[PDB]
UniProtKB/Swiss-Prot annotation:
Involved in pre-mRNA splicing as component of the U5 snRNP complex that is involved in spliceosome assembly. It is found in: Cytoplasm; Nucleus. Component of the U5 snRNP complex composed of the U5 snRNA and at least PRPF6, PRPF8, SNRNP200, EFTUD2, SNRNP40, DDX23, TXNL4A and CD2BP2. Interacts directly with TXNL4A and PRPF6. Interacts (via GYF domain) with CD2 (via Pro-rich sequence in the cytoplasmic domain). Interacts with PQBP1. This is CD2 antigen cytoplasmic tail-binding protein 2. It comes from the Eukaryota. Residues 1-59 form the GYF domain. It comes from Homo sapiens (Human).
Amino acid sequence: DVMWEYKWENTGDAELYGPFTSAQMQTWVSEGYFPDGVYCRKLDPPGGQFYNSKRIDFDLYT
């Protein structure tokens, strides 16, 4: 149950969302909701060093 998140912008104030299953992330990303990519990140464990959805691997978690 790898949970993730996505931030439209790359600021320290930008609103953060995407607290859905890694699967739900692939949908939005694959669907086209993020044509320019988003600041994808994992909820737990929380850390840092964001990564563009277009630079993350959605075939090594679920």
